[PDB]
Design a binder for this molecule. Structure first.
Ligand SMILES: [Mg+2]
Ligand SMILES: [Mg+2]
Lengths: 231, 231, 231, 231, 231, 231
């Protein structure tokens, strides 16, 4: 277990996956009862606690498919995780989305070579577990949250060579851009476990709008509640 | 239009899309009030009638993304269609599925070059309209139907060069194989309309089991009922 | 057998392959002696009759490589067809060609993934049977018909995303666009049978010119005579 | 001009294109009247003479699409060549072919990236000029030469990494392997000039059979006569 | 400067890039004079100090091309870094390498889509700055260190689907596998700055050998000295 | 061998590889003691003589990866060659380089399909033998020659379809264009022998400047001297 050093049993079957290990710290201290730090390797904090009687873990994943994939592989294969929910921010690429909107990723497009290699150029659609997608949606609805369910783009490239790199994706209905969901969805299917990616729109890549630190924390807190209730 | 010769007005905004024109005839005659044929070009029957007082059309699409894409394009761009539901059969590629199960396609993988060409080799995930997916799922649940929501593979190739062509897809959670869903989902996104593909398992490609003519009809009718209630 | 329901000797070894089943009907009724229907599945009419004492069949194929491929596979593999001649219309992409010109496809370019998958990205040239090409050419010549022998492009996509999709093809000598020849030529080679695709220019995609219905019929009949004399 | 140093009228509009400059010498000295050398750059001999009162040139090309392409480009673009006939040897990849058979390449498959780059991964079929194909065929026929008209594969790679590199090509009807035809047919189309590739089977890549030097000469001379009578 | 929050001027023009932020901490505390922490965002520690009078920074990069690329982009474009040396461990894929050997990456092969996308399928070779490569080699030589200069493979995938994934790379002379160098080398060229990747063999992927914690620290310390002397 | 007809023993282990057989003749006659021709097949001159009492061969390769690859394969596999140094000219694609500069190819980018085919679309970086690279660099330095070590592009295509084909390569640091280095470097790795490609800038593809015949000779001779001292 090279990247997570914890005894077997230290990680719950249900796990939240923020990217930032400090966001994992924040979640554990604010949302979990009796949180226990089980991982410090590479400063990639992982905690285990309880939420309304359910055992839940929260583990930083790092940025991009290659990093997140290492943690996901180890969590599933070595620690026996079964329900993986990524919680994150994303940049909106259509004006149909507003700042602070919640996006639940039905599928994840990608520019990564991950599946081009696996399927020899054929097209595999990495998808959310429908049961999780459905219940997360119901949770957001019951809170009156602006929520969209649809496509995201998982990019390898935060900083593209050219401007307006997402125009074509938007024309084909893609809602927002992040960097990991395609990897999570593909690995979940590979191992036959369940996964979901939930996102809050922190930036609007079309209007140039940005969320204030107060706005971020408020909608972030709500997202975490949704994930914890779903899981 | 070149392939549908009816005037604007003859075709309803909500449309069922079977592949076989004789299935279009069947659906129209058995499930719609006052069905009237609007198209005979290439024997590709299209009908319009009413369901619970609202107009619904039913149009044969032919087999494969290239044929279906012609009809879908014309229906949306020339006939103003807004809600497009494919109903069809599919071959199960996993033992998790049984004959007569309903599959609702959350997304559609493909071996077609359609999106490889459009996205210069990057990976686009053709997806269902979530609202239609959700409503169809709830419809199937309310009837106690065995139903799965997940991936299907839209193939160009009914007869593959080698045996076991679908095993890698199945290993990554793909439920069933058909030939059009990826086209429907991509074009719906292209035009900003709604789409869904619902399928009944008529053939099991792992077990070799096959439904009787009597069995086919019974579950097909049920699928049509689900589709009409989803509009 | 799944898409053609006829007994094993119902189809002749020589077969004309229009796309539109209503054109198959027309050909049977007007050019064959004792035409008898052998298929009605999916309204995809097929007939067998005689021409100058020899059995000939005529079978609708539907549009695009995926559809046509299903029929061609079944015809060759189950029904023992040996000589397959596609007769169709095409759109000219060069002003070197005029409306009503006959084009005999020496080979067929494609945007389909069928051979990219088969040959792992290498380039396979789907070609006509030379003997049939030569015989058809001599037939057109003997009638003083304006005829060209060269490349066609078989596209998956009747409706392209952007304007002027065929310019580069034309710069490299491609004469006209249709949707099936590449599939026909590839499968004929796969099974070691003989094939040819003959086309009438019905639309000029550069000049926007279109043939009248009377013009379509006169040249179409001529093409059919050429095809029948070639088999 | 950088690879052929001759004045602008030194080269004839009709040109034979063997690969080996020493074969160009042989052809000039044995089949042409008043042969005169016009090129010595890189030892890539080119000659102009007459055949039955009409000027004909013969120019060495070197091996492979990159080399041959340099000569073909310069010949067409700087020297005004219009009719280019490659005469060469090839390896048969099907037992349907025998040593000493003549193959006239109707088209040329390739593993070169030349058209994958040009057509962004779509498939272009490089083809012979039909008029030249037909005339050469009639010439071979008139001499009772065993002749086949069909596909060849132009490879970048004389020495493949693994055994049996050509099996799949042969399964799809490809007759023989050489290294230039695809480049010749593509550039002839690029510039709107006429081209043909004629080949003698010198080696059988299936049976391991090889022609004796005496056999090579007799059939080679025959091929040259056919080429000269075709231009 | 989203991922590194430091004032401009806080980062030296010369920077070491370990992957693990705790390795950056180790380097700063053991090799640098007056080390100052300038970054804590995402626990991705970055320090600035001096080495033998030279101002040097050390910054954690995270794992994989997507993560490392974010930091590299920001360091170069926002902080003005000019000399970037990645120091890391790698797994050897040839028995010509021994545990504890030093590898200096002359170039970096990859399975990432980074350059396939940029160059539209053409092949770009990401390379080290020769001056750095040369001087690092001279530094290792003067210490009598077992050192190899050549290819590495930068993979997206720590955990491959199949076993023996590196056999073909090894057959073409590739020395070792890591996850970032191709990204570093490509970005360095993109921005016209200088880069190098130096690696110690911590694991042997062929023999299954592994380094002891004492062995790792000893050869690691040596590598850091080499990098600091080179920079 | 098929393309080099000399016995084993005639060819030395160290070999210079110009492209032009007349350059091979030049090198042999002007730089070697007792040069003796060993090959005349296809006018592709090869010589063996001595340099400072050790045998050195010189062999023409032709133009492009397919031709050069034939000779390289035969030299290594049949003639036992162990050290292969290409000497040639190249076109500069950056203003950083001046006419008459020496370029030593650290690696070779390519548009050839050679490695795309071998590595199923992943990216292999063809590299020089570092020891030869280092020694050649030191040789050039000792003579005060303007020398650069870095990337070159090996193209299949001397005459591109559109203007400015090399600008993207230049933006990513590529120094100069030639047609063979990528082949030489890949095959050397394939066979586990040494290789290096040294080039003089004879043409500037940005400025359009060109060296005089007198200039070419002077810097060419110097390059040969460097090459012979590198053995
Ligand atoms: Mg209702
Ligand atoms: Mg010496």
């Amino acid at each position: 277990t090279p990247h997570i050093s914890a005894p077997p049993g230290a990680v719950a079957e249900a796990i939240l996956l923020p990217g930032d290990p400090l966001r994992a710290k924040y979640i554990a201290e604010n949302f979990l009862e009796n949180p226990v730090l089980y991982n410090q390797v590479r400063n990639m904090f992982g905690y285990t606690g309880t939420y309304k009687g359910k055992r839940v873990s929260v583990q930083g994943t790092g940025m991009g498919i290659p990093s997140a994939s290492i943690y996901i592989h180890e969590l599933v294969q070595f620690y026996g995780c079964k329900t993986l929910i990524r919680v994150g921010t994303a940049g909106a690429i259509t004006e149909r989305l507003k700042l602070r909107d919640l996006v639940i990723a039905q599928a994840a497009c990608t520019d990564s070579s991950i599946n081009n290699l696996r399927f020899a150029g054929q097209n595999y659609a990495p998808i959310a577990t429908f049961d999780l997608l459905r219940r997360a949606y119901e949770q957001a609805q019951s809170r009156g949250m602006p929520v969209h369910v649809g496509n995201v783009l998982s990019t390898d490239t935060f900083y593209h060579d050219q401007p307006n790199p997402y125009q074509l994706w938007a024309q084909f209905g893609v809602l927002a851009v992040e960097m990991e969901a395609a990897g999570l969805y593909t690995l979940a299917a590979k191992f036959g476990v369940q996964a979901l990616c939930i996102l809050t729109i922190s930036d609007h890549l079309i209007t140039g709008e940005k969320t204030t630190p107060q706005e971020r924390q408020e909608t972030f807190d709500q997202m975490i509640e949704v994930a914890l209730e779903t899981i």
